[PDB]
Structure formats: C-alpha cells, structure tokens
A paper describes a structure:
T. vaginalis evades host immune responses by producing homologs of host proteins, including cytokines such as [name]. T. vaginalis [name] (TvMIF) helps to facilitate the survival of [name] during nutritional stress conditions, increases prostate cell proliferation and invasiveness, and induces inflammation-related cellular pathways, thus mimicking the ability of human [name] to increase inflammation and cell proliferation. Thus, TvMIF facilitates parasite survival during infection and binds to the human CD74 [name] receptor, triggering epithelial cell inflammation and proliferation pathways linked to the progression and pathogenesis of prostate cancer.
The r.m.s.d. for superposing Cα atoms of TvMIF trimers with the hMIF-1 trimer is ∼1.1 Å, while that with hMIF-2 is ∼1.2 Å. The hMIF-2 structure has an inhibitor, 4-IPP, bound in the tautomerase inhibitory site in the amino-terminus.
Author numbering:
A (entry chain C): 14 to 80, 83 to 127
B (entry chain A), C (entry chain B): 13 to 127
Write the structure that this text describes.
C-alpha cells in the first residue's frame, strides 16, 4: 500500500484540499499499478517552507510504498504535473522516495 | 534510544483532547517497546487533509521510529495497542495506518550528540 | 544532492519568526553539510501537539535527509549546530530530537527526475 505525504506553504481551501488529495491519490494509483483502495494521501498546507533560500510557493513530498528507479521517474513527472497545473513552478517541487517492507507496515491492528 | 511516534490525522481534536492523546499514546509506546514511560517523543497533527482508500472519512497515519527494537513480533503488538487507542476514540481500525522505521545509532541525535 | 530539514514543534511562532527561522536553520544545514543554499529545503510546522519525556513543554522534532553525505562525523556537528539555534531561541537542549535519514540517489526526486 502506497502513502503520499505532502507539505506546502500554499494556502488551500477545504474544497481545494479535498479535491487535491483525490486527484493526487488517483495519480499515484495509476502510475504505481495499485488499486485506489490501498492509497493513503496526506496534505498539510500553510506550513512555512523555504527552498533555495526563497519562501515562494513550494511543495515537499515523500512517497512510501511496500516495494524502483524506473517507476520513480514516472512518479516524479506525474505528480509534478498536477502542481504545475495548479499555480506551482516545477523547480519548486521536491519528492523523496522511501520504499518499505511488509513487516514494517501496519493496518487494521496487524502487519503483513 | 528514545522512540518517536509521529501522528497525522484529519480528525479535529480540542486542546485538552490532544493533551490526553499524546500522554496515552506515548505511554502505550513505552510499555510495548520496553522503554520507560517518560522516554518517548510523540507528535500529533490534527486537521490535516487525509484521503485513505478514496474516502476523506476519519483516518490516521502514524510513523514509529526506534533505534533498533522493531522486530516483527514487537511491531504486531505495537500496531494492535495503538490501533486500540484509536478504535476507542471514534476511529475505524481499517482507517489506521502505521509505518515502522528502524534506524541506526549514528543516525539519531539528542542533546546535540549522536549515539 | 539536495538536503531537506523537516521541523515539527509545539511552540507558537509569528509568521515573521517562522520566516526568519527557515532562513537561519537552512543556512545552518548548508553550513554543516557543505552544500550551497540553492539545494536546501526547510519545512517548519508549529503548534503541533508534542509530548517529549512526559511533558508538553516546548520541544522540537527534526528529520534531516541528505543524498548520502551523512557520516556520524557530520551528524554530531549538525546535531550541535541545529540544537544551538533552538537553545538560542527559547528551547531547552534536552527537548530537541533529531533524526538523520540518508537516502539513495534513485530514491530522490526533483523536477520530475531522480538522481
């Protein structure tokens, strides 16, 4: 099951945040080959961000999935496109990939 | 060697409710991990936009980091005890997400020094 | 080789204090890590419920991610330099908790591409 954690200094409305987690979650499902059921998306807006010395609009992202280099390039491009289509500049978008193991994952009070 | 629990959720808590939660969740981590009750760092972020399984219904994402001390047996006990806290406080156990991140001694800092 | 610093704290900052803080803390990361400020990313979330050592007194949790470039030798200088900022800005040094998490080149993304 993949997880996407997003921090940004942009301010979103509740409607914008709800739509965003839906669209970004659907992007993760398509690129990663998992059903939408397994996708967890977290969005924290209005956090103080400084990237390259500037506090201009920016976004930081971490993607955790239970089990590569090929997919990460594809994931990087698809997630960035959403932000560039919503007022962001592609050089202010930052993604970190952290794949994890089954025993290090919990759900419904049990591991895998 | 103090473990850390980082919690993000879309539920809305009052200030008193957040205060009780960090104490209770922290005490749970300490008991299961065999660490003293005090020696535990807990972070709780409420009111964050969360979507799990397509739904933005009440959900919680958690990361538990400990320098070692996270084998498969302990993780199952911690997952169960933490989930019990959430199911006892209005959550559904299938909306609770836990990640375990074992780490190294040189990769952990406290009081300006690593271990 | 861009570094990333993620900060959670229960202290309350004005917008100006947060703005000064991301600049000062970022410059520290650039200094300790030997990288230019152009490649440095800093995120600061204040007013999060934090309990460290049983107390909800002012405390801070930090994660520092760098593509390699993190031996224990740097980790101690980074831990000390980062802690000094907090002890100089109203925090107690034994309430400051830092995680170092080096990641691999294939595990890092920017501008739609990995390294």
């Amino acid at each position: 099951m993949p997880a996407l954690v997003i921090k940004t200094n942009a301010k979103f409305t509740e409607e914008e945040k709800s739509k965003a987690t839906e669209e970004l979650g659907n992007i993760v499902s398509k690129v990663l080959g998992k059903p939408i059921s397994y996708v967890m998306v977290t969005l924290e807006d209005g956090v103080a961000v400084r990237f390259g010395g500037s506090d201009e609009k920016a976004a930081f992202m971490s993607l955790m999935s239970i089990g590569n280099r090929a997919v990460n390039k594809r994931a990087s491009a698809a997630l960035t496109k959403w932000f560039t289509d919503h007022g962001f500049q592609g050089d202010r978008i930052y993604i970190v990939f952290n794949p994890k193991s089954a025993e290090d994952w919990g759900f419904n009070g049990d591991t895998f």
